[PDB]
Amino acid sequence: KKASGIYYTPKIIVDYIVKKTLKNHDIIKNPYPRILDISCGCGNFLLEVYDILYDLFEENIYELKKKYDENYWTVDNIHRHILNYCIYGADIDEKAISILKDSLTNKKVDESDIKINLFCCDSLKKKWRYKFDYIVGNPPYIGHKKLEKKYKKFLLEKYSEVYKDKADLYFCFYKKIIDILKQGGIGSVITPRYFLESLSGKDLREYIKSNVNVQEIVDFLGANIFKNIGVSSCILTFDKKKTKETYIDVFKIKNEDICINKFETLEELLKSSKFEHFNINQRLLSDEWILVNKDDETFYNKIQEKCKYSLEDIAISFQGIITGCDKAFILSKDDVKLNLVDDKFLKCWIKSKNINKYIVDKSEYRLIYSNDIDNENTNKRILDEIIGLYKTKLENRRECKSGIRKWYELQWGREKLFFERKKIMYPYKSNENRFAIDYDNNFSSADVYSFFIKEEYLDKFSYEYLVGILNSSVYDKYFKITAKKMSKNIYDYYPNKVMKIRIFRDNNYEEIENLSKQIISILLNKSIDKGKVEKLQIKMDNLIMDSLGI
DNA sequence: TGGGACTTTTTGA
DNA sequence: TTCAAAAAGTCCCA
Ligand SMILES: CC(C)N(CCCNC(=O)Nc1ccc(C(C)(C)C)cc1)C[C@H]1O[C@@H](n2ccc3c(N)ncnc32)[C@H](O)[C@@H]1O
Ligand SMILES: [K+]
Ligand SMILES: [K+]
């Protein structure tokens, strides 16, 4: 399956990571460094390590010959020494190890067979017999849906310090690498960036912060590093050195449309205008890692201090309907099959794209709220001609197999009363803040999140005021500071972060609310000349900036 | 083949 | 009993 050009780490990144770890190695003082890659594959990293080592030994061959055994340190012996004592690799694929072993053997190209330290094993189960000086590589990423159940139980029992709930497989590789790193060693890996902000990575970030000194983080944000692969990458470099001060070099990319396979070295790219550099004090990291420059930190801290309320304080949040099979329960509003379904069971259905700022597009789909169907004898045509077409798939849902749900019921139908009221809705993934007031009792899947204001905060906050500030440029920038960057121009808008947004009340409340009412009034007209909306938004942003003192 | 529009349901807790 | 998180996303066209 995984036999193609994908998953090959680009040469620029491989070269950077190998150099970053061995740039300043004192081969005279320690001529026996152990370099490990625990997901070496065909040896993208290890073959480069061999070359870097060979130059390093050959450049100091006469100093080694003089300080140590004169007969042992010769140029002809460098190849044997590297393979015996220096390069280590591990991979679960037997064929990959077979190829890597031949590649290392053919580096020199008789005598006694040289023992190459390659292991065909599960790196997370191996009883590692010693720690390592340097660890580099590109671990596998496997999410919570794509992991096997038996294997996941093992991770939960043994890697509980970093792996729980919706965590990822590469969380465990981070723990393994840190655990088998020598005092004073250096590790450098490329992994997905999502653990820097995700709720799942909370324990993993705590593990890294409390056990290694993070030297450098390269955040590519939504840039496409791996061709034809939908993943966002970062490079972490960490050590176990005794140092008094622990500051992190953060290199965050500025333009996501760059092509990495166009510059000579990654170092040239990082020092250029295509990246920004700033320092974060590792002691000042909380459970959240707020990796922003001084301007954005000052901006963020001003808003946090000024706002006395959060959305969670004043709102009730909930995820959308999860049918478990959308094609079985969602039909076009013009589908002739809806004449078989009583309007009592029909609900309006919108997708994330139907959410704009301040207002929702008119629904084009309907949801059959099948939970309200009492008996199978009644409304049999609905069960036999609409929902039953997917009966086999519906029966394969978890709650149907355990008997909690009937085969025709919605898997997670939530509570209708939550949806059939005035509320605010936003897409779960978007390029910008899009918070709308729903007036039409719209239902939606889990690609749209909703909340409504608690009764006790209705006098302080109105729906019109909230969509005003939340759709403002100030709050767009404020949310994206700590949001979870998913892919190019996509952020996660999930309650675990959206409900942490903080809000304020001051003298500008009335004028902000009135401007929001004007914007809503314009956006709902048939002859909508939606140009004045931009001007009103600009005026509102000025009031908000005045309110927060920025 | 790479870029852009859009986003299901499986899953642990 | 029933919540909400999770992109080695998914899909299509020029
Ligand atoms: C494929 C991705 C996921 N890979 C990224 C690193 C480069 N991998 C790579 O070049 N693989 C490869 C390339 C070509 C071949 C062919 C010979 C052409 C068939 C075979 C394998 C991760 C490697 O980790 C290995 N892996 C996965 C789980 C896991 C674990 N639990 N313990 C230890 N090693 C683990 C897996 O076999 C991969 O080689
Ligand atoms: K000597
Ligand atoms: K990406």
Query: Which CATH number does the domain housing residue A32 bear?
Result: 3.40.50
The whole-angstrom separation of Cα A250 and Cα A30 is 30
How far are the Cα atoms of A57, A65, A532 from residue A69, in angstroms, in the given order?
14, 6, 83
Q: After which residues is chain A broken (C to N over 2.5 A)?
A: 109
CA dihedral A373, A386, A448, A539 (to 10 degrees): -100
- Comparing C-alpha atoms, which of A430, A418, A415, A446 is closest to residue A351? A446
Q: Number of C-alpha atoms within 13 angstroms, CB side, residue A332? A: 3
What is Dmax (Cα atoms) for chain A? Answer: 95
Residue A472, helix vs strand vs coil: coil
Instruction: Give me the residue label for tokens 């004090």.
Output: A281
Residue type for position A17: I
Q: Cβ distance A206 to A167 under 8 Å?
A: no
Burial class (CB in 10 A: 0-12, 13-18, 19+), A483: middle
**Tokens matching residue A192:** 């997905």
Complete DSSP assignment for A356-402: -SBSBPPP-EEEE-GGG---SSTTHHHHHHTGGGGHHHHHTSHHHHT
**Which listed ligand is nearest to A228 at the C-alpha?**
3
Query: What is the atom index within ligand 1 of the atom nearest the CA of A42?
Result: 10
Nearest residue (Cα to C1') for B12? A165
Residue nearest to atom 9 of ligand 1 (CA): A41
The whole-angstrom separation of Cα A382 and Cα A389 is 10
Nearest residue (Cα to C1') for B5? A353
Q: Give residues with Cβ within 8 angstroms of A473, minimum separation 6.
A: A537, A541
Ligand 1, from A40, A46, A93, A138: best to mutate by most atoms within 8 Å of Cβ? A93
The whole-angstrom separation of Cα A528 and Cα A515 is 16
Q: Cβ distance A265 to A226 under 8 Å?
A: no
* A58: enclosing H helix or E strand: helix A44-59
Q: What are phi and psi of A436, to 5 degrees?
A: -120, 150
The whole-angstrom separation of Cα A218 and Cα A198 is 17
Does residue A358 sit within a domain? Answer: yes
**What is the number of structural domains in chain A?**
2
For A358, left (φ over 0), alpha (ψ -120 to 50), or beta? Answer: left
Q: Cβ distance A204 to A160 under 8 Å?
A: no
Q: What are phi and psi of A236, to 5 degrees?
A: -110, 135
Q: Give residues with Cβ within 8 angstroms of A508, minimum separation 6.
A: A543, A544, A546, A547
Q: How far is the CA of A146 from the centre of ligand 1 (A)?
A: 16
Does residue A194 sit within a domain? Answer: no
Q: Cβ distance A356 to A431 under 8 Å?
A: no
- Domain limits for position A493: 313-548
How wide is the angle at C-alpha A472 spanned by C-alphas A533 and A445, nearest 5°?
95
**Which listed ligand is nearest to A257 at the C-alpha?**
3
Residue type for position A444: S
Instruction: Write the DSSP symbol of residue A436.
Output: E
Ligand 1 proximal residues by C-beta, below 6 Å: A 2-3, 7, 39, 41-42, 90-93, 95-96, 99, 122-124, 138, 140
Q: Cβ distance A331 to A337 under 8 Å?
A: yes
Residue type for position A334: D
Does residue A175 sit within a domain? Answer: no
Q: How far is the CA of A55 from the centre of ligand 2 (A)?
A: 21
For residue A163, which nucleotide's C1' is closest to its Cα? B12
- Helix orientation angle between A78-85 and A44-59, rounded to the nearest 10 degrees: 130
The whole-angstrom separation of Cα A492 and Cα A498 is 9
What secondary structure, in 3-state letters, does A310-332 show? EHHHHEEEECCCECCCHHHHEEE
Does residue A300 sit within a domain? Answer: no
Does residue A60 sit within a domain? Answer: yes
- Comparing C-alpha atoms, which of A12, A3, A9, A16 is closest to residue A43? A9
The residue from A101, A116, A138 where one domain ends is A138
**Tokens matching residue A387:** 């929902």
Instruction: Give me the residue label for tokens 């340097």.
Output: A134
Residue A449, helix vs strand vs coil: strand
Q: How far is CA A89 from the centre of its chain?
A: 27
Q: How far is CA A165 from the centre of its chain?
A: 15
Q: What are phi and psi of A474, to 5 degrees?
A: -55, -50
* A492: enclosing H helix or E strand: strand A490-492
Q: Which residues of A516-536 are buried (b: 16+ CB within 10 A; e: fewer)?
A: bbbbbebeeeeeeeeeebeeb
**Tokens matching residue A105:** 């053997």
For residue A497, which nucleotide's C1' is closest to its Cα? C5
Length of chain A equals: 550
Q: How far is CA A437 from the centre of its chain?
A: 28
Q: Which residues pair with A193 in a beta bridge?
A: none
Which A residues between 519 and 538 have a beta carbon under 7 A from any strand B atom? none
- Comparing C-alpha atoms, which of A177, A170, A141 is closest to residue A35? A177
Q: Number of C-alpha atoms within 13 angstroms, CB side, residue A540? A: 29
Question: Binding site for S-adenosyl-L-homocysteine: which residues of A?
Answer: 7, 9, 91, 122-123
Q: Give residues with Cβ within 8 angstroms of A290, minimum separation 6.
A: A297, A300, A481, A482
The residue from A88, A106, A138 where one domain ends is A138
Instruction: Write the DSSP symbol of residue A254.
Output: S
Q: How far is the CA of A47 from the centre of ligand 2 (A)?
A: 30
The total of other beta-carbon atoms located within 10 Å of residue A291's CB is 19
Does residue A7 sit within a domain? Answer: yes
Proximity of residue A445 CB to strand B below 7 A: yes
The total of other beta-carbon atoms located within 10 Å of residue A401's CB is 11
The whole-angstrom separation of Cα A97 and Cα A101 is 6
Q: Give residues with Cβ within 8 angstroms of A404, minimum separation 6.
A: none
**Pairing, β A423-427 against β A448-453:** antiparallel
Residue A117, helix vs strand vs coil: strand
Complete DSSP assignment for A282-299: GGG--SS-----HHHHHH
Q: How far is the CA of A77 from the centre of ligand 2 (A)?
A: 15
Does residue A252 sit within a domain? Answer: no
- Comparing C-alpha atoms, which of A492, A501, A401 is closest to residue A461? A501
The whole-angstrom separation of Cα A493 and Cα A197 is 12
Q: How far is CA A10 from the centre of its chain?
A: 20
Measured in Å, how far apart are chain A's first and last C-alpha atoms?
53
The whole-angstrom separation of Cα A472 and Cα A197 is 23
User: Helix count (H) and strand count (E) of chain A?
Assistant: 21, 22
Q: Cβ distance A212 to A135 under 8 Å?
A: no
The whole-angstrom separation of Cα A255 and Cα A269 is 11
Q: Give residues with Cβ within 8 angstroms of A93, minimum separation 6.
A: A2, A41, A120
The whole-angstrom separation of Cα A532 and Cα A331 is 36
CA dihedral A156, A162, A165, A168 (to 10 degrees): -100
The whole-angstrom separation of Cα A443 and Cα A489 is 26
Q: Cβ distance A322 to A410 under 8 Å?
A: yes
- Comparing C-alpha atoms, which of A479, A472, A496 is closest to residue A292? A479
* A425: enclosing H helix or E strand: strand A423-427
Residue A346, helix vs strand vs coil: strand
Q: Which residues of A336-352 are buried (b: 16+ CB within 10 A; e: fewer)?
A: eebeebeeebbbbbbbb
**Tokens matching residue A184:** 């004073």
User: Which residues get their CB within 7 angstroms of nucleic chain C?
Assistant: A 7, 39, 138-146, 166, 168, 192, 194, 198-201, 226, 229-232, 317-319, 322, 399, 404, 412, 414-415, 429, 446, 449, 484, 486-487, 490, 492, 494-496
Strand order in the sheet with A315-318: A315-318, A448-453, A423-427, A436-438
Does residue A203 sit within a domain? Answer: no
The whole-angstrom separation of Cα A173 and Cα A10 is 20
The residue from A88, A123, A138 where one domain ends is A138
Q: Give residues with Cβ within 8 angstroms of A17, minimum separation 6.
A: A45, A136, A188, A189, A190, A235, A237
Instruction: Give me the residue label for tokens 């450049």.
Output: A59
Handedness of CA A401, A403, A408, A409 (dihedral sign): negative
